[PDB]
Design an enzyme around this catalytic site. Structure first.
Site, PDB file in Angstrom:
ATOM      1  N   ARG A 159       4.806  -4.075   4.958  1.00 23.66           N
ATOM      2  CA  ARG A 159       6.357  -3.636   4.742  1.00 23.66           C
ATOM      3  C   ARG A 159       6.966  -4.280   5.805  1.00 23.66           C
ATOM      4  O   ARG A 159       6.244  -4.613   6.903  1.00 23.66           O
ATOM      5  CB  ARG A 159       6.859  -1.909   4.930  1.00 23.66           C
ATOM      6  CG  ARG A 159       8.091  -1.616   4.888  1.00 23.66           C
ATOM      7  CD  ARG A 159       8.597  -0.302   5.132  1.00 23.66           C
ATOM      8  NE  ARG A 159      10.180  -0.382   5.685  1.00 23.66           N
ATOM      9  CZ  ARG A 159      10.214  -0.100   6.011  1.00 23.66           C
ATOM     10  NH1 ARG A 159       9.947   0.593   7.392  1.00 23.66           N
ATOM     11  NH2 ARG A 159      12.081   0.206   6.814  1.00 23.66           N
ATOM     12  N   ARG A 179      25.992  -0.603  13.501  1.00 25.00           N
ATOM     13  CA  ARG A 179      24.970  -0.413  14.770  1.00 25.00           C
ATOM     14  C   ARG A 179      25.722  -0.925  16.421  1.00 25.00           C
ATOM     15  O   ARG A 179      27.019  -1.170  16.126  1.00 25.00           O
ATOM     16  CB  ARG A 179      24.378  -2.177  14.877  1.00 25.00           C
ATOM     17  CG  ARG A 179      22.760  -2.055  13.507  1.00 25.00           C
ATOM     18  CD  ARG A 179      21.537  -1.354  14.228  1.00 25.00           C
ATOM     19  NE  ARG A 179      20.167  -0.995  13.328  1.00 25.00           N
ATOM     20  CZ  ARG A 179      19.145  -0.633  13.914  1.00 25.00           C
ATOM     21  NH1 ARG A 179      19.305  -0.785  14.878  1.00 25.00           N
ATOM     22  NH2 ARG A 179      17.377  -0.762  12.793  1.00 25.00           N
ATOM     23  N   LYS A 218      15.692   3.132  -2.404  1.00 26.74           N
ATOM     24  CA  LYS A 218      15.757   4.261  -0.535  1.00 26.74           C
ATOM     25  C   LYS A 218      16.537   5.264  -0.980  1.00 26.74           C
ATOM     26  O   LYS A 218      18.017   4.787  -1.044  1.00 26.74           O
ATOM     27  CB  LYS A 218      15.633   3.149   0.360  1.00 26.74           C
ATOM     28  CG  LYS A 218      14.463   2.624   0.649  1.00 26.74           C
ATOM     29  CD  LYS A 218      14.878   1.382   2.139  1.00 26.74           C
ATOM     30  CE  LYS A 218      14.813   2.607   2.631  1.00 26.74           C
ATOM     31  NZ  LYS A 218      15.408   2.408   4.451  1.00 26.74           N
ATOM     32  N   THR A 239       9.360   7.804   6.944  1.00 25.84           N
ATOM     33  CA  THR A 239       9.552   8.061   8.196  1.00 25.84           C
ATOM     34  C   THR A 239       8.649   9.073   9.003  1.00 25.84           C
ATOM     35  O   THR A 239       9.143  10.172   8.309  1.00 25.84           O
ATOM     36  CB  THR A 239      10.687   7.944   7.904  1.00 25.84           C
ATOM     37  OG1 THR A 239      11.631   7.273   7.246  1.00 25.84           O
ATOM     38  CG2 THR A 239      11.179   8.394   9.270  1.00 25.84           C
TER      39      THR A 239
END
Ligand SMILES: O=c1cc(Cn2cnc3ccccc32)nc2ccccn12
Ligand SMILES: O=c1cc(Cn2cnc3ccccc32)nc2ccccn12
Ligand SMILES: O=P(O)(O)OC[C@H]1O[C@](O)(COP(=O)(O)O)[C@@H](O)[C@@H]1O
Ligand SMILES: O=P(O)(O)OC[C@H]1O[C@](O)(COP(=O)(O)O)[C@@H](O)[C@@H]1O
Ligand SMILES: O=P(O)(O)OC[C@H]1O[C@](O)(COP(=O)(O)O)[C@@H](O)[C@@H]1O
Lengths: 510, 519, 518
Positions: free
Chosen positions: C60, C107, C257, C315
């Protein structure tokens, strides 16, 4: 483990449950399935009715297809004479119900000229002209049903004399499908037709009123095709007969197709296989039977399996292997009651037929796969706020857990015991009531052993409750259902009057 | 969903499955349950037999309690004439098996007033003398009753119950003797000639295989019968005795043990292991044990046979009223349907076909009920239980058999086509009880006949010669089964079927399962 | 005695648990796909070689950082390491490449012009959020810049803002034109370029940004096997990713996702549009209350198993392994329970991307999955998968369930499937057999993408097409017998299920054979 098919009861699969069915595992004394006997020339007398009761009859059925009111009143008087001859001992007194099976609407041919012959693929005209009603012949046949043309179409079948003759379509012309001896004033059946005949005929109104006067417990209402038919029966019984149970007889395709609305409108159902087998192909009866029993079990409503259960016993003292099987499989299906018609009404061995139903029903009840049945009943019943419903399922669970000798239910109307019965415990349900009609009606529900309390009402209600529970304990000990030290389930309510059952106790037998 | 009770098939519970059974939901063409017909005077002619075949008869049963060898040889001859009259078209030919049902350790009475048709009315409480003195073997009446069981007096005691004619008449031993018994009529009725006698309490010492049985079994081998229904099997040694009597010449004849007494029920498991299959012989069984317990013995035997994958036959009085009536009683319709629902591989007709007034109507009725009841089966629970109860094995053939059945449920296949020499491969499939019929293609006529014992097997006899290239010979038999199924309406072009074949010639190599469309 | 077969026999799930045996060792085969995030810890060809020996199946690449030039060199290293094993085709293991989009990320800026500098944020203190690009490289304990220009418009007074994997929480006190005065609820070390979450806010950022478009186009150019699409909220977002990939990337698997509330609420429409799902627990655990993530996870694994579409659990599966050579008990339990839940794949993020023990974390995921696969209650699972599966007219679906049934009946060493597109092997995997599915293919993309399905062990046949088709089928079946024997999945005399078709090409799988291993 070696009794009551308890090794078979422990199987984790139905296949293995069947592999473990044991002819050497004796059943208990309790027989849960109610037995309905049709009364007739072979069983009408008091002496015989006493033996019928001792052999296991729970409901006396009176067929109003024939006989006068005077005749039927005398049959009823005889049933009550034989029944009250046992009243002196309330511990052993077995209540006995009286059922009135209506004639219902029917189609009948006219008078011949007396017999005539029909054959292969010949012609026969169906006329409605009331001038041909006295002159029935091979070329033309008259019927009393004026709306026959409206309910029948091109390719519709007409069955004459209990299905003996088959035919194919202000008049109708038929091509004979199966011939034979064409008689006078014979019954006609209309397969697949939505027959518009009255729910209750003129004679039925008179009979239903006679039934109210005679204090009958239940009515077996013939040829029920829709919910409105039941409503008409209910209206004819009125206020005076508001407590009389109505069992709807499903006899044709329409009744089967409109089944859910009939079940909701009725107090119970009769799988009237005789008429049904004439109306639908006979190889399909078993389907209609298994569907109706399943749906009645699902609604918690009593279902009766009727017609030719032990037919050969009219002439023989032992039944055929198919008959032994049919009785067992009606119990295994989940039928609350099993019926006898010609076998008790006209036959040579009425007492033997009653005794055989009792023996088979008792073996079949131990053979039920309660493990699966109870999980499926639980899973399919709605979650409600009703305290009595939760109490009833709780009692059944407790009875399976401690393998109790009985579930003692205090009931006025019967409802609290009916609620226990729909969960099908293995333990017999002793319904203690003071209502003589409730005690009689209770025979309609699988597992219920009704006992009529004759003891006077005590002033301290809690003492009166205890007295009725102790009575049930005495009936249990006397009939050998359980003994001192055994565990039983006891159901009672939080105050006098119906609708308050909410107390479940696990009690040792004194 | 509107056909073959597929709405009911989808139910998550058995109660709901029962709630969904629909009289308006029509079944498929194929009928899985085999029909065994007793052949007697009402059904012996080639004319009638052709019509029995057409009506659905799969097995012809010969009851060796009566008739000479000559009579039986002619019945067998007539069965073969009727069967071969359809052999011109191999696509429409239906194999028909011949079953020999033994007399066995039977106890029978003599003649009432020297006539095989005369009767005496016996009264309750009356005294009746039983004799072994052969002077009365044709001079039987309301006072003297001769029977052929020479050791009756030893195995019977005072108070012992003696049942006569399907247990319809009952007697009690009041005074014992050397060759006589003074009895009291407990249950009356009309006593006829050469009636069956039962002694449920008695330890009957009659041989497993009688002198008459040895002659009949020999005749069965000579006559090339497909199976023997061995009467009154009590223990595994009795089965072994029949098997040894048939020896090498009869090694491929299937042995069906008839359970008709308490010992047979009790020692069922060892009998089953020894046998090729079972008959629930309800007639005698219902006299030997209380009649109310018969359904328990019947379901225990069907379940155990289904669990073992060995054929089970439900027999006696299934449509009894039809000996005299063209329509059955509701109890009879029920019994037939319930034998099918229980898991019976075969259902049987006795007097209904042998001597009754409506033998073709009885065959037709069993066909109609069976097919209705096969759709009504709760395959979802049955297949799960059959899988869970069957062991994990290294046998490639068994794994292919269950994979094939799984595939047949997933695509609701019109059939499972199986190439088989001995029948084993098609037998392994029937064990898992698929809804789709099993078209068993074989070149072996005996296999084709014997396959009728298994639920679902529709045997077909391939007459086409063996091709040089084995793979082409395989495809030829598969196409032959495609032709049969289409012609009989089991399926049509484009439908999906399951095909079972092996990886090399000879028995024991079935390992290939294919999901193919109908050409 | 082995692979929890005594627990396999249990008539109830409760008894199934009671019979779980620490002395019942698993088979050699591991059915659950291991997805590894590549980073500085795992980028060298030498480390990648060891990652492949440890059990990595999918490499990934997180496109939240790095340039195309950097990612192209990563992909090259993955391919160099994968192709080092091509010398022996029996032992060669296909390795897939997954591109993970940045999506609508929020961010922060740089702490005092440094990428490593940190400030202490104390509980109770005021923090000013600014949109003014004069402060983009001047963040500290008083001022914090973020790249989401429309932040003021979508948030209100009282609103909560989470910073750095939701470890720092701020409460909006004053709202402004291009600023927000907030209060520190959960304090700690504030670093540079950390991710921001606005759980209650209606974030208006595009599903597929211009940067995402470029990355997606680069994905097609780099011949990636699949895309992991970040923050998918609806069907239209998947259709947007699909459109960008276009005809050239039509065979690239889209894995949506799920990492927000709307994504969960619209899951059905999302799943219909996608080729598979990622239970993106990191952001999901911040976007919704952390105590609800297991609910969302089990709902998504169940619906994907029911749809036959791949599902990845992701995760913090072995998070403590970033700094330690062994995981916590909770981490061991988590990996076990994702497999038990029915996840086709398990993922490693930080543990392989930047941690100190990457090979250890992969090995541990391999050991746990294998244990958990033997612990599955196949009896109930197979019965429920069959019951919930529709009755088809598809011969291939009928052949696949038949093969799975046959594998249970004989407890086969494997289900060998010959497949061009991989569909035939995927149809076998949707029924969850215990036996490993050896999917033999000549198509390399098929072999790489087969790692997304539980139980599929892809083998790439090098051998050229034999002249006689039956011989070409036998060559490939023998190749699988050889792979299975070398990897110790079975030995001579064992029984295996073989699935083939009646003619060459895709869509003709209809043949099931029960064969002994030669
Ligand atoms: O699975 C079965 C099969 C049967 C046989 N059977 C009797 N009427 C049937 C109607 C339809 C199908 C099977 C039927 N009875 C039960 C009883 C309890 C639980 C499971 N059962
Ligand atoms: O069949 C299953 C599977 C799972 C998942 N699972 C959780 N620990 C497991 C241990 C072994 C196998 C599966 C396991 N949970 C349940 C819960 C209730 C009923 C059935 N269940
Ligand atoms: O089944 P029903 O008719 O609701 O009757 C149950 C009733 O019987 C009782 O146990 C006793 O009531 P009585 O004392 O009026 O007979 C009640 O507490 C309960 O509500
Ligand atoms: O059921 P059985 O007797 O084992 O026969 C099945 C056999 O039939 C076949 O399909 C064909 O064999 P033949 O060509 O010898 O008839 C074999 O491959 C298989 O082993
Ligand atoms: O899984 P897919 O893509 O349908 O491919 C499966 C195909 O593989 C085969 O087994 C072999 O095909 P090739 O010989 O063309 O490679 C086919 O018979 C079958 O249809």
């Amino acid at each position: 483990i070696q009794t009551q098919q308890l090794h078979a009861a422990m199987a984790d699969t139905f296949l293995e449950h069947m592999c473990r069915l044991d002819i050497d595992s004796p059943p208990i004394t309790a027989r849960n399935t109610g037995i309905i006997c049709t009364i007739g020339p072979a069983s009408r007398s008091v002496e015989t009715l006493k033996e019928m009761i001792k052999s296991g009859m729970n409901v006396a059925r009176l067929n109003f297809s024939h006989g006068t009111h005077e005749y039927h009143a005398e049959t009823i008087k005889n049933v009550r004479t034989a029944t009250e001859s046992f009243a002196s001992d309330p511990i052993l007194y077995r209540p006995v119900a009286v059922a009135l099976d209506t004639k219902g609407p029917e189609i009948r041919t006219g008078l011949i000229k007396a017999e005539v012959e029909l054959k292969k693929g010949a012609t026969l005209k169906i006329t409605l002209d009331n001038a041909y009603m006295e002159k029935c012949d091979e070329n033309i046949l008259w019927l009393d049903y004026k709306n026959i043309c409206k309910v029948v179409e091109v390719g519709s079948k007409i069955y004459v004399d209990d299905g003996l003759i088959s035919l194919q379509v202000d008049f109708l012309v038929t091509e004979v499908e199966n011939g034979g001896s064409l008689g006078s004033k014979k019954g006609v059946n209309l397969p697949g037709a939505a027959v518009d005949l009255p729910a209750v005929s003129e004679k039925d109104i008179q009979d239903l009123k006679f039934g109210v006067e005679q204090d009958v417990d239940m009515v077996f209402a013939s040829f029920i095709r829709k919910a409105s038919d039941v409503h008409e029966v209910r209206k004819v019984l009125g206020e005076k007969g508001k407590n009389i149970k109505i069992i709807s007889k499903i006899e044709n395709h329409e009744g089967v197709r409109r089944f859910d609305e009939i079940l909701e409108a009725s107090d119970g159902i009769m799988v009237a296989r005789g008429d049904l087998g004439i109306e639908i192909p006979a190889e399909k009866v078993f389907l209609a039977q298994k569907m109706m029993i399943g749906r009645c079990n699902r609604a918690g409503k009593p279902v009766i399996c009727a017609t030719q259960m032990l037919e050969s016993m009219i002439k023989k003292p032992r039944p055929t292997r198919a008959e032994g099987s049919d009785v067992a499989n009606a119990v295994l299906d989940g039928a609350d009651c099993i019926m006898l018609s010609g076998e008790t009404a006209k036959g040579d061995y009425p007492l033997e037929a009653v005794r055989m139903q009792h023996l088979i029903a008792r073996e079949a009840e131990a053979a039920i796969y309660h493990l699966q049945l109870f999980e499926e009943l639980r899973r399919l019943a709605p979650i409600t706020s009703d305290p009595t419903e939760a109490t009833a399922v709780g009692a059944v669970e407790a009875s399976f857990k401690c393998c109790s000798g009985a579930i003692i239910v205090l009931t006025k109307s019967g409802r609290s015991a009916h609620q226990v019965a729909r969960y099908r415990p293995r333990a017999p349900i002793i319904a203690v009531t003071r209502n003589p009609q409730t005690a009689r009606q209770a025979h309609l529900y699988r597992g219920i052993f009704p006992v009529l309390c004759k003891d006077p009402v005590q002033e301290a209600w809690a003492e009166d409750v205890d007295l009725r529970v102790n009575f049930a304990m005495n009936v249990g000990k006397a009939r050998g259902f359980f003994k001192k030290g055994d565990v039983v389930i006891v159901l009672t309510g939080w105050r006098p009057g119906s609708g308050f059952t909410n107390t479940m106790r696990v009690v040792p037998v004194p």
